[PDB]
Amino acid sequence: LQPFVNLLSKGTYWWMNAFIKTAHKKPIDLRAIGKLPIAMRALTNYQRLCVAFDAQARKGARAIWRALCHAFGRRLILSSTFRILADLLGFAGPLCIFGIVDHLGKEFLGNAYVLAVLLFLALLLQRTFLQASYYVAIETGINLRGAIQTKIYNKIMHLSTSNTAGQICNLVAIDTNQLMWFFFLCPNLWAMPVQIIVGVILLYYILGVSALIGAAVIILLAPVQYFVATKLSQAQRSTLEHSNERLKQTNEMLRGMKLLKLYAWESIFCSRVEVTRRKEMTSLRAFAVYTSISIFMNTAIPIAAVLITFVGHVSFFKESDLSPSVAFASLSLFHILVTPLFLLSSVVRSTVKALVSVQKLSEFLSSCVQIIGGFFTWTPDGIPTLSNITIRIPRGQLTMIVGQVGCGKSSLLLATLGEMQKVSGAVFWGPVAYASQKPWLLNATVEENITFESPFNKQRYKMVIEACSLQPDIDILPHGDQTQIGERGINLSGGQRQRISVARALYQQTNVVFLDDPFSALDVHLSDHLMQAGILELLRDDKRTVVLVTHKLQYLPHADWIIAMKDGTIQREGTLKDFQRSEPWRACTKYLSSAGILLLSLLVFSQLLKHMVLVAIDYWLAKWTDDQSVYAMVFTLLCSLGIVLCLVTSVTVEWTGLKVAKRLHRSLLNRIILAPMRFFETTPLGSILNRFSSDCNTIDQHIPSTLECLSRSTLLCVSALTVISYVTPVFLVALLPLAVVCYFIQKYFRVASRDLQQLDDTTQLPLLSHFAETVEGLTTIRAFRYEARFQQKLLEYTDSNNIASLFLTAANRWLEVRMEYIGACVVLIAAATSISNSLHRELSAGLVGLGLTYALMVSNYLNWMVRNLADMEIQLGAVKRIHALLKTEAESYPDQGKIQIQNLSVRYDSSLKPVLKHVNALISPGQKIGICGRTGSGKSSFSLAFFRMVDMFEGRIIIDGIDIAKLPLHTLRSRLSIILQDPVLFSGTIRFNLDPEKKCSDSTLWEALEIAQLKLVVKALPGGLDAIITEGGENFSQGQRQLFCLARAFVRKTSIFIMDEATASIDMATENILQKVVMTAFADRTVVTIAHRVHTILSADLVMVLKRGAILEFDKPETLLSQKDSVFASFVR
Ligand SMILES: Nc1ncnc2c1ncn2[C@@H]1O[C@H](COP(=O)(O)OP(=O)(O)OP(=O)(O)O)[C@@H](O)[C@H]1O
Ligand SMILES: O=C(O)[C@H](CC(=O)N1C[C@H]2CCCC[C@H]2C1)Cc1ccccc1
Structure with a gap:
């Protein structure tokens, strides 16, 4: 509820504080999250986008861009205005460090203390404009996804059935997200040029021409940073090919596992999956190389720029002597140009991907009964499929549509409906219960499918299931009723599915019913039962118009009207007489345990040694500014040693990431193979397979990169808080309060954000699932006239998606505003105490600059440390649940046909009722x-008992002289x-x-x-x-x-x-x-x-x-x- 609150609470997200504290105690539910504001609803955004489209088109790929610009442009420059305004207020740190340090080493701005509160106020004021800039861009990006998804869906309710069921869902899940994420990073498209240009202009004034040479290096390395991003994404796709190929080979192994373990072919199919895995691991090396280079450039280009900026300034140009104010003001400018200059690659990459998505999206958006004459063709222009189709079925009377196979039987039914473009002819014809020739089932309960968004009646339902006689079939099903019939109807059988669609048709109370071949896969015995009880004793009883089209002519006599189809033409339509006359740190330890003591030692020692160089570089600068070629000699060496270690600590985290990812999967696969048959039947297949799909993917590609981000930020924040403490030892007193406060803010975030990330995901599935359901059964939906009822069900689904995603963005902003407030409070204590020490005590002007240039950056490191730790906690769910599955059980390890059984006391499971007992037999060879x-x-037990698959055989079986x-x-x-x-x-x-x-x-x-x-x-x-x-x-x-x-x-x-x-x-x-x-x-x-x-x-x-x-x-x-x-x-x- 941000709009209602005042400016201060909206800027600081104080309204989110109570929600965070409440969610820390009990999990977030749909009741906890309130209804959406009027301004941000799917219906409101959809209406606004439609108004924009009407305005633009009243006077293509250009129009949708204009409509997206017109509808969501006012709330987008308001996001860009903050981002620009935060960029300008960003330079109040580098400029004020110039002011403070210079005065110490040498009109209210002339006082060093006054600038310490201006640095505090500007940093406090900047880090809310920047955050309120992120939110309004996100709130517009999310409101856009609401308007497009409804816009895409409203096209689905129109497109001709002649045409791609999976494309539309992909268009919702991927192409719309790429468009949405363009509006997240839309203001940066106008803020990177402003922030960088003012940045590079400032460097020239502060430092001289030598600042351009250092600034040119970073800018000139943005394309090379971008080029790696292209080579990486190419490598990820080629890895995705083998992973999908592997999951097919694994899935066949788990599904037909009983057949494999009966023939003892488990090892052979395990060998074949590993061959695909090794190819995937080979293509995953190149993904590690181009991730290692990406980490190397992002932590060795900032160092390289500093190396050439200062050494060149003292060696080549021999300009004004380097001074603590100039060196450290300029150094703090580089730290705030690299973040814009390294994200510019992702902004350009997002924009080139958004241009494609709109073009792809605009390509999609462009795609009784009596009839007089009539010529219908599925194609917009071509040979008419139905010609001379002149019919008049009676009202309230059963009519049979019978003819040759593939001759205008199902098309004529769809000809009555609106799914056929009319070449000519005249047709005049409420909603119709249409039982599709190919049945479609909603991803819902069997009770829900039959009622199909209609009020339930106990008496009506009882007759229907008895008439269709599908209830005895559901008895054998694993669940008595309310079974979750997912996509494709895998849970149900082909014959059972046909009854359900006919049951849905028979249940509804409407005058006109089109049953399109109800006996396509219906047994002859049940077919008479369904026809006599349902079509005649139930459907014909209610004085309901019924039209049936099947090959079985046995029911033709029990029909008021019947028509004959020949070559797609209605030759004759008459009665029977007329026709006849005419014719978790414990998991993290487990993860790092598998890496190897050698790599783990090299990993830890390289990180700690790198951040003892990245500080010894900055400290040396503070000693330098206060022989002048000698200082350049040591500073150049340390910059090279910092660069070399940036290469070593970038390879090792990726080299380690592959070593664990290879061993963890291979050790997993060989464990489930040895599990007894009882484990595969008891545990659902979904549990085992998702370990090989997602968890082995998270470890492959996400943990090694995250582990670097968390390990790099944590050590930086330790270095930032150590250098800032050695400069001013009095800062340690204020470190304890800011450590306790910074802990709770981290705690309440990890508890609250973990809930919302799960809540965000679980509401994504119904949204995508609804797109699949509509496209698969589009003809049936428009037959019932449930288009409006189904479209309304979308708004509820997508609103519950936005609000679940509009708290995940208000939770992150809540955290970053708090940490940036803490960081803006550290810079005041660092400035106040150092200036107190520098003026009165014997502190130097250089060390003052070194304290401030880290005080400004301790806000970012605190933010990455808690955000990465939040993600590292979630991504360690992959290792936690793999290691649980990895500890399953393990089974122990014919010339003549004489088989003998000794009491055959075989138990179907551990501590269960014995299937067979005291069974003695002896079969001669x-x-x-x-x-x-x-x-x-x-x-059925004796079948698997001879193969030792029954793991409790308390007896003896002697086959050909052995046991x-x-x-x-x-x-x-x-x-x-x-x-x-x-x-x-x-x-x-x-x-x-x-x-x-x-x-x-x-x-x-x-x-x-x-x-x-x-x-x-x-x-x-x-x-x-x-x-x-x-x-x-x-x-x-x-x-x-x-x-x-x-x-x-x-x-x-x-x-x-x-x-x-x-x-x-x-x-x-x-x-x-x-x-x-x-x-x-x-x-x-x-x-x-x-x-x-x-x-x-x-x-x-x-x-x-x-x-x-x-x-x-x-x-x-x-x-x-x-x-x-x-x-x-x-x-x-
Ligand atoms: N997407 C489509 N594009 C073109 N033609 C189509 C399409 N869908 C259906 N048809 C037409 O519909 C015909 C099948 O329906 P028709 O009523 O003519 O036969 P039928 O007797 O109902 O067939 P069946 O026993 O297969 O159900 C196809 O032969 C084809 O001409
Ligand atoms: O701090 C962050 O890096 C932001 C994270 C965030 O706020 N969200 C909320 C969105 C909900 C829909 C899908 C997930 C994104 C991630 C992302 C971001 C937003 C704007 C600018 C830069 C980054």
Whole structure:
């Protein structure tokens, strides 16, 4: 609430003080953050931008710039006016140091004390204009993002469906941010020229022509600073290529982990991910080189400029003798030109990226029922897709739209709606509940999807779910209801999704309903259930106009009207009779522990030795000004020794950063591979994967750079407070109060800012997610006429994004205003005490300048120390949670088919109910054993029990004379065939997905593919036995993929085969093909089949029934059918 408060509280952000103190105690919630001010709302900014657009266009890429300039120009020069005004008041430090030091070494301005309060007042007054300049630029930048995101969205509700779903979200998340961040750094575009030009002009007057030569070096090194920034960002992209390639290879490893650990291919796929990692680490060296140079230039160009400015002034020109006032006033000017001169690279880089974004943004912004005649074409001009489409469906009566495949069926429905440009014809036609041919699901609850922003009724909902008969399906789902169906509907199944969209159509209370192929993936049994109960007994009962378009003609007789489509034309439209007649410092220690004692010693000793040179340089200047070639000799040497150490301390932090980033990931990968199968099922995949994506990214690129920023600022602030204390020892008395105050300000910030950074991120996701939802189901939204209702949901989402981001900026300004006040209070104590000592005691004029030139800079170092420490705390969440995951568990480490089980006391998990108990069996070599039982009756345990994956087997299994327990895991899994229920084939060649051990012969591998009756399609692939297959994908069918897994099984030749519900998720013909292959090809080798199919184990040598723990296991299935009273298997079959 900055506008309401007065000028003083607004400048000092006193209104934020109570919020900070309150948030320190309890976490920030949406209730804690208030509603947005009227002036800064998404709707208000959007209306202002629309007014600007109307004004500009009333008389392209130029227009949007004019509208952005017109709407947000008044609150932008007001930001630039402060920035310029703060720049001029900035030179009241360097100029007043000139005044103070000169008077000591030699009209109220003639007094040294008077200038000590002018230095105090100007520094106090500058460091609020500068901060109020940052805020108003930010508050305009954030208010702009609110206006554009609404502007982008209001275009989405219009664009034709002929066209890029992911581009629009990218346009919101990246292209708008680059435009927003241009308005953060917009005033600098007019303030760098003013601040630098006055700066360089001042240096000439203070020091002479020699100040230009030193000033030219810094300016001339801005392009080289910029060039490194270009080479770095190129290197980051090339690293981003391998990281995305790595995450694909890792994701396939975690998802299909059970298949891998069954075949003992965990090491092979772990080896393949490391090969991609090493390439990423190679491309990450160049990112370290061009980050090392970037740190080297930013701390060795200021030193180089000082070296050439002073040495050149005394050696070449032989001008006026160097004096403490001139040398230290000029030195303090360099410290305040480098910050503008080194950010100018990022300002130009941002401006060239903002020019692209606007052009990219302006490219996006430019993109019953009776019909008379009618010609509709998806293209703006071309062959009309619908021709002679003249229809008149009745009101309140069901109508069927039936025709050939791909012949104007779904287009005609969209022709009735407004998504088809009319070449000609006349159409006259409220909101319509349209069940899309391709169903779309909101990223929300199953209850939310069906109600779809409509009031809930208990009776209505009960009938709908019973009619669609999707409730029994949700019963098997992991959650009873309110399941979070994310993007793409991965949680739900294809057939289940189709019902939901039809359920959404059937739930709504509207007169006209267009159900576009409700039975596309609906089973024939349920399809009649949905049609009879829902379409007829529910939809037709309510006197609701229903239009249905499906291939199943069985429901044609139960239809008032029916139309026939031919070649995209409505040939005839009549009734059935008419138609028939016509036709954490603990984590930081863990991070620095892995670097190595050698590097860690070199890292620490280089930092401490560098800042004993960067002070011994400045102290030597204070001794110099008071033989004159001798002083230049030592000062040149120290400047070179300062530069050399700036190179060493820039390589080491990056060299260390790679050494940890390499070891931490590699040590992480080898740990989860050895985790037992129980760990992967219990822990959600999202938890493990995000460690490899974000945390291994934060350590790769963010920690090493931040660790340098925090270590460089902390030592500078220690050096600044030591030099300023050696000059005036009385300053130590005031150091304790300013240490206690500076601690609490740091504490309340880190507590409050950490909350808002998390709150900022968690409100970003709903905003982007809403853009994806709108574009994916744009046709459905405009069918319900929920465009206005959906657009309103954006304003709430983006307002909760701005206010969460408008406190993160008011928190930073709160901190920087406090520290700059503390720093402006240190400069008074430093000035007051040194001048007291210099005039009365025997202090020198040079040491006075040395104290002041650090007092001015102790405000910045205090600010970087607390801001970097805030970021270093957050970025150490990467190491903290990796080290937690890194301590997971670790598993310990066939000639004849005789397998024996000793009581099989196997427990599905630690300290749980035993799945199977007291199960004794003995299968002779070369015998086909079958296992059948109820779902969850322990049959599924015996499948994984033979592979020691059940980690609590309190019994014994003897296979071919040995024990499956004593033998090591990677030597027992590798010699036992398995066929999981759901087939999976991982990315790689066919030769590298059927024998990754690279031991199979080329001729043999072809026979195995042919043995599975698969050689024809395999040979048909390009290359042959080397075609680059994709994970799942379309290169193979579901029957073929399950068929290929049989070929992979035949490759092992382990003489013991275990099949676990291979029949499921397969075709009936393929099951006969698979069963015939197993019966014929695998005649020997003791095939064991655990499945629910009746006919799978009918011909087996022996069949074992499974009760809660064990049931009758008749060796002869023929005897079992008679003995079981035709109940156990005969009745089930
Ligand atoms: N973005 C698009 N650009 C061009 N044509 C399009 C586009 N979207 C759809 N179409 C047209 O719509 C046709 C499919 O709809 P149509 O009603 O003609 O067939 P259908 O019988 O409903 O098909 P299906 O069984 O695939 O649902 C395509 O063949 C194409 O001519
Ligand atoms: O001190 C800072 O360096 C500023 C940090 C800050 O205030 N914010 C708030 C913004 C919210 C939206 C996204 C994050 C930014 C970061 C950034 C900045 C603003 C203006 C000028 C220079 C730097």
